[PDB]
Design an enzyme around this catalytic site. Structure first.
Site, mmCIF file in Angstrom:
data_model
loop_
_atom_site.group_PDB
_atom_site.id
_atom_site.type_symbol
_atom_site.label_atom_id
_atom_site.label_comp_id
_atom_site.label_asym_id
_atom_site.label_seq_id
_atom_site.Cartn_x
_atom_site.Cartn_y
_atom_site.Cartn_z
ATOM 1 N N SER A 80 58.796 -79.943 88.248
ATOM 2 C CA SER A 80 57.749 -79.713 87.325
ATOM 3 C C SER A 80 57.585 -78.038 87.488
ATOM 4 O O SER A 80 57.899 -77.376 88.462
ATOM 5 C CB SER A 80 56.568 -80.430 87.538
ATOM 6 O OG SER A 80 55.776 -80.338 88.556
ATOM 7 N N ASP A 117 44.105 -70.246 80.826
ATOM 8 C CA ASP A 117 42.651 -69.782 80.853
ATOM 9 C C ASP A 117 41.912 -70.605 80.227
ATOM 10 O O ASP A 117 42.137 -70.780 79.005
ATOM 11 C CB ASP A 117 42.689 -68.272 80.286
ATOM 12 C CG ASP A 117 41.470 -67.549 80.477
ATOM 13 O OD1 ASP A 117 40.317 -68.311 80.318
ATOM 14 O OD2 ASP A 117 41.280 -66.277 80.683
ATOM 15 N N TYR A 128 45.452 -59.654 76.256
ATOM 16 C CA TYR A 128 45.369 -60.858 77.407
ATOM 17 C C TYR A 128 45.210 -62.182 76.743
ATOM 18 O O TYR A 128 46.250 -62.857 76.979
ATOM 19 C CB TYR A 128 44.188 -60.340 78.156
ATOM 20 C CG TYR A 128 44.033 -61.470 79.312
ATOM 21 C CD1 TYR A 128 44.721 -61.705 80.202
ATOM 22 C CD2 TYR A 128 43.110 -62.532 78.983
ATOM 23 C CE1 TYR A 128 44.577 -62.777 81.204
ATOM 24 C CE2 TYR A 128 42.805 -63.710 79.772
ATOM 25 C CZ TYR A 128 43.663 -63.745 80.854
ATOM 26 O OH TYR A 128 43.513 -64.731 81.608
ATOM 27 N N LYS A 147 48.047 -65.271 76.830
ATOM 28 C CA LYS A 147 47.498 -66.662 77.216
ATOM 29 C C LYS A 147 47.619 -67.798 76.212
ATOM 30 O O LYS A 147 48.110 -69.097 76.528
ATOM 31 C CB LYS A 147 45.905 -66.687 77.792
ATOM 32 C CG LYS A 147 45.929 -65.978 79.416
ATOM 33 C CD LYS A 147 46.774 -66.698 80.325
ATOM 34 C CE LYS A 147 46.416 -66.102 81.645
ATOM 35 N NZ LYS A 147 47.543 -66.435 82.668
ATOM 36 N N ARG A 194 44.497 -64.317 96.563
ATOM 37 C CA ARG A 194 43.752 -65.097 95.646
ATOM 38 C C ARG A 194 44.358 -66.442 95.353
ATOM 39 O O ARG A 194 44.555 -67.285 96.082
ATOM 40 C CB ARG A 194 43.486 -64.031 94.257
ATOM 41 C CG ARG A 194 42.736 -62.853 94.921
ATOM 42 C CD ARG A 194 42.639 -61.598 93.762
ATOM 43 N NE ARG A 194 42.401 -62.095 92.530
ATOM 44 N N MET A 237 46.268 -62.996 73.630
ATOM 45 C CA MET A 237 47.447 -63.412 72.959
ATOM 46 C C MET A 237 48.404 -63.840 73.813
ATOM 47 O O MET A 237 49.074 -65.039 73.730
ATOM 48 C CB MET A 237 48.003 -62.091 72.268
ATOM 49 C CG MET A 237 47.188 -61.659 71.041
ATOM 50 S SD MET A 237 47.635 -59.959 70.353
ATOM 51 C CE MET A 237 49.124 -60.575 69.870
#
Ligand SMILES: NC(=O)c1ccc[n+]([C@@H]2O[C@H](COP(=O)([O-])OP(=O)(O)OC[C@H]3O[C@@H](n4cnc5c(N)ncnc54)[C@H](OP(=O)(O)O)[C@@H]3O)[C@@H](O)[C@H]2O)c1
Ligand SMILES: NC(=O)c1ccc[n+]([C@@H]2O[C@H](COP(=O)([O-])OP(=O)(O)OC[C@H]3O[C@@H](n4cnc5c(N)ncnc54)[C@H](OP(=O)(O)O)[C@@H]3O)[C@@H](O)[C@H]2O)c1
Ligand SMILES: NC(=O)c1ccc[n+]([C@@H]2O[C@H](COP(=O)([O-])OP(=O)(O)OC[C@H]3O[C@@H](n4cnc5c(N)ncnc54)[C@H](OP(=O)(O)O)[C@@H]3O)[C@@H](O)[C@H]2O)c1
Ligand SMILES: NC(=O)c1ccc[n+]([C@@H]2O[C@H](COP(=O)([O-])OP(=O)(O)OC[C@H]3O[C@@H](n4cnc5c(N)ncnc54)[C@H](OP(=O)(O)O)[C@@H]3O)[C@@H](O)[C@H]2O)c1
Ligand SMILES: Nc1nc(N)c2c(n1)[nH]c1ccc(O)cc12
Ligand SMILES: Nc1nc(N)c2c(n1)[nH]c1ccc(O)cc12
Ligand SMILES: Nc1nc(N)c2c(n1)[nH]c1ccc(O)cc12
Ligand SMILES: Nc1nc(N)c2c(n1)[nH]c1ccc(O)cc12
Lengths: 249, 249, 239, 249
Positions: free
Chosen positions: C136, C142, C155, C159, C13, C157
């Site tokens: 870098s 998100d 999830y 991100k 992905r 929290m």
């Protein structure tokens, strides 16, 4: 002379009326600014003066941007000093709201939407500060400025400009002991004429109770920000939106 | 065959660097200017020496007034007249000066600061969209909008309104395949009028290298946003600030 | 000669698309994986066929535990042993599933969601910085962090924590010339596609990878502490 | 019947001020503490002398571990055991110390900084909701999370995660009539360990009065958010920072 005094713009109806009533109930003398709604403004002043004499006056002004807007804003602040000898609180509530699709002349739309939502607040803030204990300004913002309604670019620009005024004026006026904050409704009073089927579409989006805010619930946040319980609060915008702004598409 | 771009305030400094880099990428460019006629013509001469018939100048005042819509329509029309298409609009032109709240008319300051930073971008966006692939608009924003310069209320209001326009126009113009994004410099080319000691004070605040952004570094982010590498990006504002906006007082 | 990059969760992905595009740009790559060994080796075989000895794999569990610091040190060390340098770290690996507040143990969910999405990026950042020309780090964030999915508290929290790390690390590592930025995908159901303003264009892993390539490039040398949303305008859409 | 509140980290400083103001407003309180047993008991004794049987203590470590869920369930259960109800949860307990990226084990630092600032609030929110009228949760955030202190990565990550919890929990608990909000101090009570010179460096940065927030100023915003005057407010974080977060580097 010991009661503080407040100016509320667009105070004849809806949220501004609720703010003016709650400030009056808290012990403020009020200037009820209005544009077209004279009968409603006068009815509110008469109600407030029946409750305590000589505690409310009205002040008419168009807040559309124009060459005369600075003088009009100076005269609104002056109306508070002439009636009450002081001006402790300014609530920038008056606002034009209608779509301006990108695809009335467009410059009239600019003058109305940017004037009422941003330039008039700025000029009223200049006049308020120049004429100057718990002094504060509260700006009526919009909780949904970052997920805006389709085809409302000028309205949205005006409300974003008002965020910037809130922050800039909080920084610059802090040394004078003037706090500057905002209240950001999500969905509050819907249009009387809007079909209940369309109102219900909006109500069903609100996490907290599947209802719009009352005008009084908005006014409660204004009352907090002007109170002694908010003496260290400046440059803050309190969302009063029932969680609406947290809901994804 | 070659796409065409309008760059406002393109005669000097960041706008010039954007116009050069678009031209080096393959664009035909309209170099908009207000007062800087000699610089605008010099730049068009340089770009035309490289490829003939690939640069024209267009003069306009972007102060708000009842004829600003016509001036903005004319800037977009100048791109279609020269090149037969208009693929990219870069809203770079901007007035910047203090407007203290406590003590040019204030209405002229409103017209210049809100006109150049917000209303002209809005009207250019309308004209760009109406006259219509990889179509996009890039607005030059300000990374420090939430930690503003003392006494810059109207400038800050205009740059906040530009954020609102970027978001509202991204939502509304997405169905037409027009992307709308922003580039937010921190400290880039310092004002020509600033003394060396003040310049070095600002340089020392920047975490990444203790230096201001070059005009070319700002232009690089514009080039990305107009490129095929950004075709799913809309409503985004890229800070190009060396970390300045992360630094507390 | 050629710079080198670590990509976590690189077997499938978005991580895979990032690894391929960094390789195409001229990087040597470490392909990190947890369970997807066959896919990681298949990718490394595809990249090494294009240019010999330019891709290696590295196994690690990124769940938080007493050994996660050592595992994150090993991933960075793997880059230095293969390639003699580590120029880019892409924190792509992520766990994603709901954690309802009202009714795996909840502490296992903390260790996975908060560990993979925030603590591992922190420890990899420490190891990357401690081992140090265009350096870098890019964190996969998100775009919907402020309009979260219902029942995704842990999830979300994690991100948000990763935004905090992006900003804190940008500030602290700027003196070392290490830039730290993020890329925030939106959606990468037809229900979700119909809401996207730019939904005429299909969302792709390559579009996310394009933003990563920009941020690691010389065209981004002044950019640190920035998060680029790559969401087709989805985060602008009201309920 | 009087409502009841849990305040974490309530033995001293801001948590004590919150417990005291909730008690003065008519709440029964659970004073949670970790190490400060003498201070916690001294506070409960003072509140019980004002009104008998209105305060209890509850000791717990809020470091993350495989026992933390049981500890958080026990804190909520202690409010029901004492008072028969639990109306308000205030997540105030917090570890705060630097964790430099370049050179306690690091996993201990993670467990303490992310446990106290984020995982314990999450688990207490789960326990509060599962055990269930004006129910609300107030999280103590940080106004400077986007302009963080150098070398405080884990602390900042924990406070950003708390913002995420505030928003996620507001959305998910709204249907149960539980509001979830935050209060974000800038500089309030300075660390006991800090020298006066260093404290004065921070004080001089604050626009509004060049001084830190009192503990009571922070508690005032908590009292507003738990009050009937905030019944439509959820997912909001009120900065109480004197304008500090508006000040550029
Ligand atoms: N209602 C909501 O759901 C909602 C949502 C988000 C934000 N807000 C904000 O909350 C505030 C109050 O909202 P609302 O719905 O009560 O407002 P509203 O009814 O739309 O407007 C308030 C008043 O603004 C005055 N106004 C409009 N144009 C004016 C002009 N050119 N010059 C001077 N005054 C003018 C009008 O006074 P006259 O009637 O005297 O002419 C009007 O009664 C506004 O700032 C609004 O943006 C409201
Ligand atoms: N420089 C920075 O550090 C910095 C920082 C944050 C944001 N930005 C933004 O980045 C962009 C470029 O910055 P810059 O420093 O290169 O800008 P600048 O030199 O201050 O101004 C750019 C050009 O704007 C034009 N302009 C000003 N008033 C105008 C009017 N009334 N009508 C038409 N054009 C007008 C001028 O054109 P003529 O010369 O032809 O009159 C000027 O050359 C601006 O949007 C700016 O706000 C810059
Ligand atoms: N997909 C989207 O639309 C979207 C939206 C928003 C944000 N993002 C962000 O973009 C990035 C990539 O998204 P994606 O959908 O490509 O991710 P994904 O497929 O859900 O997961 C990527 C990889 O993370 C690794 N991973 C998961 N748990 C792990 C653990 N405990 N230890 C080590 N590795 C672990 C896995 O590697 P193995 O297979 O090797 O075990 C997995 O293949 C993520 O950071 C995600 O949060 C994606
Ligand atoms: N003070 C400020 O200027 C400021 C600025 C920004 C944000 N805030 C936030 O406001 C809140 C109050 O700040 P404060 O300065 O009053 O906090 P504080 O004194 O640093 O800490 C409050 C309490 O947290 C408890 N705590 C620490 N580690 C713990 C653990 N492992 N388990 C359980 N409890 C633990 C301690 O309880 P014991 O003493 O019983 O061990 C301590 O009394 C905090 O959330 C803080 O992050 C404060
Ligand atoms: N002056 C003004 N009046 C309104 N009725 C709204 C408004 N501003 N902003 C709104 C945002 C949402 C909404 O349903 C209504 C409004
Ligand atoms: N039109 C325009 N010109 C400038 N020189 C700046 C500007 N806008 N915004 C700035 C912000 C910081 C700065 O140092 C300079 C600027
Ligand atoms: N690790 C990981 N995997 C995903 N599939 C998503 C994710 N993170 N965040 C997402 C957000 C939206 C979505 O549709 C999917 C995801
Ligand atoms: N638990 C805890 N304790 C503190 N003393 C601070 C804190 N959190 N955050 C702070 C931010 C600024 C500051 O001067 C102090 C603090």
């Amino acid at each position: 002379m010991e009661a503080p005094a407040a100016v509320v713009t667009g105070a004849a109806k809806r949220i501004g009326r609720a703010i003016a009533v709650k400030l009056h109930q808290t012990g403020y003398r009020v200037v009820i600014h209005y544009h077209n709604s004279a009968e409603a403004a006068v009815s509110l002043a008469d109600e407030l003066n029946k409750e305590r004499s000589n505690t409310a006056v009205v002040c008419q002004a168009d807040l559309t941007n124009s060459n005369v807007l600075p003088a009009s804003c100076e005269e609104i602040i002056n109306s508070c000093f002439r009636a009450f000898g002081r001006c402790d609180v300014l609530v920038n509530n008056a606002s034009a709201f209608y779509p301006t699709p990108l695809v009335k002349t467009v410059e009239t739309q600019v003058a109305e939407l940017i004037g009422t939502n941003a330039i008039a607040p700025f000029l009223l803030t200049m006049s308020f500060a120049q004429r100057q204990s718990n002094l504060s300004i509260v700006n009526l913002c919009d909780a949904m400025v970052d997920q805006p309604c389709m085809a409302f670019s000028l309205y949205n620009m005006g409300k974003h400009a008002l965020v910037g005024l809130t922050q800039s004026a909080a920084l610059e006026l802090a040394p004078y002991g003037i706090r500057v904050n905002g209240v950001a409704p999500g969905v509050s009073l819907l249009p009387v004429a809007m079909g209940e089927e369309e109102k219900d579409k909006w109500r069903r989006k609100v996490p907290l109770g599947r209802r719009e805010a009352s005008a009084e619930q908005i006014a409660d946040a204004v009352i907090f920000l002007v109170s002694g319980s908010a003496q260290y609060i400046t440059g803050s915008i309190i969302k009063v939106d029932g969680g609406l702004s947290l809901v994804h598409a």
